[PDB]
């Protein structure tokens, strides 16, 4: 029920915003995080995929059709670059 997660500042603001406006979105993000902690970066729900170009080293999983969880795993520690598409 607890995960020690490192956020980028914009990823944390979007995560907090989801907490007071869309708990259905927080729960789906949390399910992705739990899957990453259990299975590693490339296995589990959310269609995990490596990213390329200047996103090399990071991965994406689908939160919904629009939003992506963009993350990397550094010695089993999860770092979150994004949890919300910024149009």
């Amino acid at each position: 029920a607890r995960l020690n997660i490192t956020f980028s500042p914009q990823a944390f603001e979007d995560y907090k915003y989801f907490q007071q406006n869309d708990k259905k979105m927080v729960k789906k993000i949390n399910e992705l995080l739990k899957s990453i902690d259990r299975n590693g970066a490339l296995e589990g729900i959310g269609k995990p995929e490596k990213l390329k170009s200047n996103l090399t080293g990071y991965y994406s999983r689908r939160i919904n059709h629009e939003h992506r969880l963009v993350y990397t795993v550094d010695d089993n520690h999860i770092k979150i670059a994004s949890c919300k598409y910024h149009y």
């Binding site: 607890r2 995960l3 997660i5 490192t6 956020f7 500042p9 949390n30 390329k52 990397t72 994004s82």
Partner: protein
């Protein structure tokens, strides 16, 4: 890791190229006499490419990803125990 062969080679050496595309992360270009060539890549590489383009295609999101990855790299970050 690009490999360039012609059409008649690619007909009967299909798994010989399909496996080395997935195992070695290679790609294969198949040339043509009318030069409507094709490129073969793994499904992972195709999805990775499409996902990267999706994340870059709005400049506010490309900028948000660049700034966030930068902040992660220098440690300007927020680390919390969160309920999951």
């Amino acid at each position: 890791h690009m490999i360039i062969k012609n059409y008649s080679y690619a007909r009967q050496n299909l798994k010989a190229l399909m496996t080395k595309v997935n195992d070695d992360s290679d790609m294969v270009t198949v040339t043509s006499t009318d030069d409507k060539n094709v490129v073969i890549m793994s499904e992972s590489d195709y999805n990775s490419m499409m996902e990267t383009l999706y994340l870059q295609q709005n400049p506010n999101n490309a900028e948000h990803l660049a700034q966030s990855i930068a902040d992660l790299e220098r440690g300007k970050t927020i680390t919390k125990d969160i309920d999951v």
